[PDB]
Amino acid sequence: NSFVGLRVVAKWSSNGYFYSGKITRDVGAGKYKLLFDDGYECDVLGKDILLCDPIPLDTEVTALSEDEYFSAGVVKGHRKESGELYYSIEKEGQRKWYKRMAVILSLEQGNRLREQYGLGPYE
């Protein structure tokens, strides 16, 4: 019945980006323990957790291109046939697949989605 077990996209620690993870504990006072998909764990405030699973079509996101540089793109599709989520991300009229954990949100991109998808609460 609780928020535990939900897949989320959440601000990591006090960094500039939100990353994919899972809520593993309600630690009280509107904070949650998260297990991030890369294996790291931290406590995150509810205001900094997005509940959209998956991130929806036409969302502006960030991803690594060519194993070289991070830049923005737009979500244009999803694949979950294998039981693992992949996103189709469009950059400059061209699309490429990205595993769930490779799609991240800058503070601007993630804060944008609070009104629609934030855990919260928000006053």
Ligand X SMILES: CN1CCN(c2ccccc2N)CC1
Which spans of this chain sit near ligand X (rule: CB under 6 A)? 12, 15, 19, 36, 38, 40
Q: Are 51 and 117 in contact (CB under 8 A)?
A: yes
* Residue in 30, 35, 25 with CA at minimum distance from that of residue 122: 30
Kindly state the tokens that stand for 122.
Answer: 């928000």
CB of 101 to ligand X, least distance (A): 8
CB of 113 to ligand X, least distance (A): 17
For ligand X, the closer of residues 51 and 95 by Cβ is 51
CB of 102 to ligand X, least distance (A): 11
For ligand X, the closer of residues 19 and 32 by Cβ is 19
